[PDB]
């Protein structure tokens, strides 16, 4: 699906931007009020979102599937880091022809 391919394209930009600390692109990629969900707790703000995801050292972000609903999407995928696989849900919204990251939950 075109929707899955676009999420994958933005995922590649996201992981590279996190790896290199490209703050300008991260600010364009991630909603300022983004939420990171770790062990069921919502952690609020793009600052902590970036800090904690950068700390993880994500080596690859694989998309399992994508469901688009209007201007929003929920993606199930796998983050690879610490030599382990972590299931994640990723929520995005459409903005000016881009996907913006709104929340990510590590299962």
- DSSP per position, 19-82: HHT-HHHHHHHEEEEEEEEETTEEEESHHHHHHHHHHHT--EEEEEEEEEETTEEEEEEEEEET
> Would the CA dihedral through 82, 13, 78, 99 be positive or negative?
positive
Tally of domains in the chain: 1
Report whether 41 contacts 27 (CB < 8 A): no
Report whether 49 contacts 37 (CB < 8 A): no
Q: What is the dihedral of CA 9, 12, 16, 17, to 10 degrees?
A: 50
Q: Write out the residue range of the structural domain in which residue 83 sits.
A: 1-107
In angstroms, this model's resolution equals: 1.5
């Amino acid at each position: 699906d075109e929707d899955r391919e676009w999420i994958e394209r933005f995922n590649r930009i996201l992981i590279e931007s996190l790896t290199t600390g490209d703050e300008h692109t991260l600010k364009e990629l991630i909603d300022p009020n983004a939420r990171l969900v770790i062990n069921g707790r919502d952690i609020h703000g793009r600052e902590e979102f970036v800090r904690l995801l950068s700390e993880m050292g994500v080596k690859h972000f694989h998309v399992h599937d994508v469901k688009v609903v209007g201007n929003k999407a929920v993606t199930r995928g796998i983050l690879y880091f610490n030599g382990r696989e972590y299931d994640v849900d990723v929520f995005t919204r459409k903005i000016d022809g881009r996907w913006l990251y709104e929340s990510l939950e590590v299962k």
